[PDB]
Design a protein around this motif. Structure first.
Motif, PDB file in Angstrom:
ATOM      1  N   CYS B   4       0.809  -1.219   0.000  1.00 42.98           N
ATOM      2  CA  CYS B   4       0.000   0.000   0.000  1.00 42.98           C
ATOM      3  C   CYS B   4       0.845   1.274   0.000  1.00 42.98           C
ATOM      4  CB  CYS B   4      -1.040  -0.011   1.116  1.00 42.98           C
ATOM      5  SG  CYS B   4      -2.230  -1.383   1.002  1.00 42.98           S
TER       6      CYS B   4
ATOM      7  N   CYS C   4      -6.730 -20.756  -2.673  1.00 43.47           N
ATOM      8  CA  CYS C   4      -7.778 -19.941  -2.047  1.00 43.47           C
ATOM      9  C   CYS C   4      -7.237 -19.033  -0.945  1.00 43.47           C
ATOM     10  CB  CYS C   4      -8.930 -20.810  -1.550  1.00 43.47           C
ATOM     11  SG  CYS C   4      -9.744 -21.790  -2.842  1.00 43.47           S
ATOM     12  N   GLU C   6      -4.087 -17.918  -0.775  1.00 47.87           N
ATOM     13  CA  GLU C   6      -3.259 -16.938  -1.481  1.00 47.87           C
ATOM     14  C   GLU C   6      -4.135 -15.784  -1.995  1.00 47.87           C
ATOM     15  OE1 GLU C   6      -0.177 -15.987  -1.816  1.00 47.87           O
ATOM     16  OE2 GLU C   6       0.433 -15.733  -3.917  1.00 47.87           O
ATOM     17  N   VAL C   7      -5.251 -16.117  -2.680  1.00 47.89           N
ATOM     18  CA  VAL C   7      -6.220 -15.157  -3.225  1.00 47.89           C
ATOM     19  C   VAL C   7      -6.803 -14.299  -2.087  1.00 47.89           C
ATOM     20  CG1 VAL C   7      -8.449 -14.912  -4.461  1.00 47.89           C
ATOM     21  CG2 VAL C   7      -6.715 -16.500  -5.327  1.00 47.89           C
ATOM     22  N   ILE C  10      -4.119 -11.770  -0.814  1.00 48.85           N
ATOM     23  CA  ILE C  10      -3.951 -10.642  -1.753  1.00 48.85           C
ATOM     24  C   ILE C  10      -5.146  -9.691  -1.637  1.00 48.85           C
ATOM     25  CG2 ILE C  10      -3.429  -9.851  -4.125  1.00 48.85           C
ATOM     26  CD1 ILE C  10      -2.642 -13.072  -4.517  1.00 48.85           C
ATOM     27  N   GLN C  11      -6.380 -10.250  -1.559  1.00 51.06           N
ATOM     28  CA  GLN C  11      -7.615  -9.474  -1.406  1.00 51.06           C
ATOM     29  C   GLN C  11      -7.585  -8.577  -0.161  1.00 51.06           C
ATOM     30  OE1 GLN C  11     -10.863  -9.305  -3.719  1.00 51.06           O
ATOM     31  NE2 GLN C  11     -10.191  -7.509  -2.568  1.00 51.06           N
ATOM     32  N   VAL C  13      -4.839  -7.432   1.498  1.00 53.41           N
ATOM     33  CA  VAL C  13      -3.793  -6.428   1.279  1.00 53.41           C
ATOM     34  C   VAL C  13      -4.308  -5.295   0.374  1.00 53.41           C
ATOM     35  CG1 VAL C  13      -1.410  -6.014   0.475  1.00 53.41           C
ATOM     36  CG2 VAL C  13      -1.939  -8.109   1.741  1.00 53.41           C
ATOM     37  N   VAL C  14      -4.927  -5.647  -0.773  1.00 55.92           N
ATOM     38  CA  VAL C  14      -5.481  -4.695  -1.748  1.00 55.92           C
ATOM     39  C   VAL C  14      -6.597  -3.842  -1.115  1.00 55.92           C
ATOM     40  CG1 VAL C  14      -6.637  -4.447  -4.014  1.00 55.92           C
ATOM     41  CG2 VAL C  14      -4.689  -6.005  -3.779  1.00 55.92           C
ATOM     42  N   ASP C  16      -6.991  -3.103   2.061  1.00 57.84           N
ATOM     43  CA  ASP C  16      -6.338  -2.255   3.054  1.00 57.84           C
ATOM     44  C   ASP C  16      -5.662  -1.013   2.407  1.00 57.84           C
ATOM     45  OD1 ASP C  16      -5.088  -1.345   5.452  1.00 57.84           O
ATOM     46  OD2 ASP C  16      -3.629  -2.978   5.496  1.00 57.84           O
ATOM     47  N   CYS C  17      -5.456  -1.009   1.072  1.00 57.24           N
ATOM     48  CA  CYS C  17      -4.869   0.149   0.379  1.00 57.24           C
ATOM     49  C   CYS C  17      -5.877   1.288   0.259  1.00 57.24           C
ATOM     50  CB  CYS C  17      -4.312  -0.245  -0.988  1.00 57.24           C
ATOM     51  SG  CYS C  17      -2.891  -1.375  -0.929  1.00 57.24           S
ATOM     52  N   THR C  21      -8.910  -1.512  -7.225  1.00 59.97           N
ATOM     53  CA  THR C  21      -8.065  -2.589  -7.744  1.00 59.97           C
ATOM     54  C   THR C  21      -7.430  -2.280  -9.110  1.00 59.97           C
ATOM     55  OG1 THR C  21      -9.363  -4.089  -6.385  1.00 59.97           O
ATOM     56  CG2 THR C  21      -7.999  -5.111  -8.048  1.00 59.97           C
ATOM     57  N   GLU C  22      -8.202  -1.680 -10.045  1.00 61.81           N
ATOM     58  CA  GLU C  22      -7.680  -1.336 -11.369  1.00 61.81           C
ATOM     59  C   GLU C  22      -6.625  -0.230 -11.307  1.00 61.81           C
ATOM     60  OE1 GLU C  22      -8.085  -3.105 -14.375  1.00 61.81           O
ATOM     61  OE2 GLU C  22      -9.132  -4.519 -13.055  1.00 61.81           O
ATOM     62  N   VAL C  24      -4.504   0.131  -8.602  1.00 63.48           N
ATOM     63  CA  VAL C  24      -3.369  -0.594  -8.016  1.00 63.48           C
ATOM     64  C   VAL C  24      -2.598  -1.251  -9.160  1.00 63.48           C
ATOM     65  CG1 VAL C  24      -2.613  -2.471  -6.457  1.00 63.48           C
ATOM     66  CG2 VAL C  24      -4.482  -0.948  -5.751  1.00 63.48           C
ATOM     67  N   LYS C  25      -3.313  -2.011 -10.020  1.00 59.18           N
ATOM     68  CA  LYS C  25      -2.752  -2.693 -11.193  1.00 59.18           C
ATOM     69  C   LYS C  25      -2.047  -1.703 -12.147  1.00 59.18           C
ATOM     70  CE  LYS C  25      -4.027  -6.028 -14.777  1.00 59.18           C
ATOM     71  NZ  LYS C  25      -5.200  -6.543 -15.520  1.00 59.18           N
ATOM     72  N   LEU C  27      -0.905   1.475 -11.564  1.00 56.76           N
ATOM     73  CA  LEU C  27       0.242   2.111 -10.907  1.00 56.76           C
ATOM     74  C   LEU C  27       1.443   1.161 -10.819  1.00 56.76           C
ATOM     75  CD1 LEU C  27      -1.713   4.079  -8.141  1.00 56.76           C
ATOM     76  CD2 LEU C  27      -0.642   5.118 -10.126  1.00 56.76           C
ATOM     77  N   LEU C  28       1.205  -0.127 -10.488  1.00 60.23           N
ATOM     78  CA  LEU C  28       2.276  -1.140 -10.431  1.00 60.23           C
ATOM     79  C   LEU C  28       2.849  -1.396 -11.839  1.00 60.23           C
ATOM     80  CD1 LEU C  28       0.889  -3.754  -7.800  1.00 60.23           C
ATOM     81  CD2 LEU C  28       2.680  -2.023  -7.405  1.00 60.23           C
TER      82      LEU C  28
ATOM     83  N   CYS D  15     -12.936 -21.592  -4.130  1.00 59.90           N
ATOM     84  CA  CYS D  15     -12.571 -20.306  -3.518  1.00 59.90           C
ATOM     85  C   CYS D  15     -13.785 -19.387  -3.337  1.00 59.90           C
ATOM     86  CB  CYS D  15     -11.463 -19.607  -4.303  1.00 59.90           C
ATOM     87  SG  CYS D  15      -9.915 -20.545  -4.450  1.00 59.90           S
ATOM     88  N   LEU D  25      -6.160 -10.427  -9.045  1.00 65.19           N
ATOM     89  CA  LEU D  25      -5.405 -10.457  -7.787  1.00 65.19           C
ATOM     90  C   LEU D  25      -4.042 -11.132  -7.940  1.00 65.19           C
ATOM     91  CD1 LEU D  25      -8.381 -11.181  -5.349  1.00 65.19           C
ATOM     92  CD2 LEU D  25      -7.168  -8.997  -5.508  1.00 65.19           C
ATOM     93  N   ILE D  28      -1.700  -8.753  -9.802  1.00 66.96           N
ATOM     94  CA  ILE D  28      -1.223  -7.676  -8.917  1.00 66.96           C
ATOM     95  C   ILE D  28      -0.050  -8.165  -8.057  1.00 66.96           C
ATOM     96  CG2 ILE D  28      -1.894  -6.312  -6.832  1.00 66.96           C
ATOM     97  CD1 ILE D  28      -4.579  -5.736  -8.351  1.00 66.96           C
ATOM     98  N   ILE D  35       8.566  -6.149  -9.538  1.00 65.65           N
ATOM     99  CA  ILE D  35       9.151  -4.837  -9.215  1.00 65.65           C
ATOM    100  C   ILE D  35      10.328  -5.043  -8.231  1.00 65.65           C
ATOM    101  CG2 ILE D  35       8.679  -2.680  -7.894  1.00 65.65           C
ATOM    102  CD1 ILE D  35       5.826  -2.751  -9.430  1.00 65.65           C
TER     103      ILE D  35
END
Lengths: 46, 58, 46, 55, 45, 57, 57
Positions: B4, C4, C6-7, C10-11, C13-14, C16-17, C21-22, C24-25, C27-28, D15, D25, D28, D35
């Motif tokens: 983040c 599941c 792992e997904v 990630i969900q 973490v994203v 919490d930003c 989502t689009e 985040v993608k 910018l990265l 899931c 996800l 990302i 990076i």
């Protein structure tokens, strides 16, 4: 920061000077890259 | 904190350029494509020369 | 449990930003493009 | 091939997350790790440059 | 060679009885998962 | 010759009597399958190397 | 600059073939996919051989 914005500003100046739409520049460079990648693959295979 | 924080940092840098995000992406993609073409040309001359050297001195 | 979990991680973490989502993608993707350009310049001029 | 596809389908369905979200996800996470790898390779190329100078 | 290869892949995909776009999406997810694992191992090593 | 290469690919694709977008999709599926196999092989090699480096080093 | 020159060079070659740009791109993508499948098969046999050599020696 100024390294990123300055880089973007430089690319923008160069692209604007060509007077070629940005999507055409991208497509033409993609075609050249695809052609060179095919040549490299043929060389590696032989 | 790391993921983040990274996203928030990139957002600050992009916002400071005062250039639409999709323009930044397109311009960087064009620069990358140009440099990749140069690298491919160098790799092709290098593979050709390497193959010849192997023949001459092998 | 592996996939599941792992997904789901990630969900979390994203989310919490507090950034779509689009974005985040995108910018990265811009950061990756910038770093790849730097690496290419170093490889070409050294 | 069919057995592999059927297996991935079972895992994704379990899931209870839409397939396009799973894909986004994972993309990302991969972008973030790529990076980090690029930053490590750049400090490695800078170190290689310095070693050439020193020796 | 080329046409025979395409015809062979078509036979395999048709036998799965799964829409072609789903086959592509599912294989893309598996590849992304494996690439993440490989990146994690490379980064610590 | 760029034009000769394009003309050759066009002849081959036309002879298959399969729409170009299907040819592309089918080749993409085959490539994805082989890339998954290569990744699995690389991951078993990296996993073994990691374990050995930990145990003896 | 150098990219304006590179862009006109590619345009000159593509225009000479008298084939729509999107067809040129699609046909080159199909050829690249085919060659990448062949390269993946070669890399997979190489990785299998490397694994066997580690076992034998």
């Amino acid at each position: 920061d100024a390294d990123v914005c300055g880089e973007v500003a430089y690319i923008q100046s160069v692209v604007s000077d060509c007077h070629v739409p940005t999507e055409d520049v991208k497509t033409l460079l993609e075609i050249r890259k695809l052609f060179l990648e095919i040549q490299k693959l043929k060389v590696e295979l032989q």
